[PDB]
């Protein structure tokens, strides 16, 4: 077909992209953020949180932001006959940044800190810390 990047960004409730040709796609890996493009090696990565940033071939300069909670990314080499290299971004909850809020975010942060102040269980402490992480990411990412 073409030497583009065939992105499919999919959540269970909605598939935002299916075979979308793009140029570069930034993703917040568990180690750190990284940008996948055509020619990138085969790889699997776990995501933690943050703002995926898609950049179509027609756009070039224009972008598209999507906040992801958790999930995986699968980059697969290009078949010899297809001429195009594929990428699959699976997210358990993939929102855009336009639909986010910082006030309900801070309210949930306060309620989480209230619930976790009685730190007794490991899962409770871990959930409090991870909620702090994700809510700070949401606050920093929202407009």
């Amino acid at each position: 077909f073409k030497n583009q990047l065939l992105l499919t960004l999919s959540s269970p409730s909605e598939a935002i992209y299916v075979r979308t040709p793009v140029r570069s796609v930034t993703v917040p890996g568990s180690e750190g953020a990284m940008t996948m493009t055509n020619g990138h090696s085969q790889t699997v990565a776990r995501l933690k949180a943050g703002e995926i940033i898609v950049r179509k071939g027609e756009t070039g300069d224009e972008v598209e932001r999507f906040f992801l909670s958790d999930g995986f990314v699968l980059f697969k080499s290009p078949e010899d006959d297809s001429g195009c290299c594929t990428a699959e971004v699976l997210g358990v909850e993939v929102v855009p940044v336009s639909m986010l809020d910082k006030e309900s975010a801070a309210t949930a942060l306060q309620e989480l800190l209230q619930q976790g102040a009685g730190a007794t269980d490991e899962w409770t402490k871990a959930r409090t810390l991870l909620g702090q992480e994700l809510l700070s990411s949401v606050i920093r990412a929202a407009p």
């Binding site: 180690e31 750190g32 953020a33 943050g50 990411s137 920093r140």
Partner: protein, 71 residues
Amino acid sequence: AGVASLSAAIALMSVGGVAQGIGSLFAALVSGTARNPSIKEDLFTYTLIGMGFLEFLGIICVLMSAVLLYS
């Protein structure tokens, strides 16, 4: 007495180690900003905090070098 030159030059060797530390620190910044380019600020803060101490160390090394030079 040219001999007092030698000590000062020897003191200058420490500056190499200081440079090494500085390099490592800035590498840690240039990596961190790529791992998390959203912040780019709280890392620069700690970078400057460390560079304060490293520049202080380099400056006192230079001063001791000049002291052992002239005396």
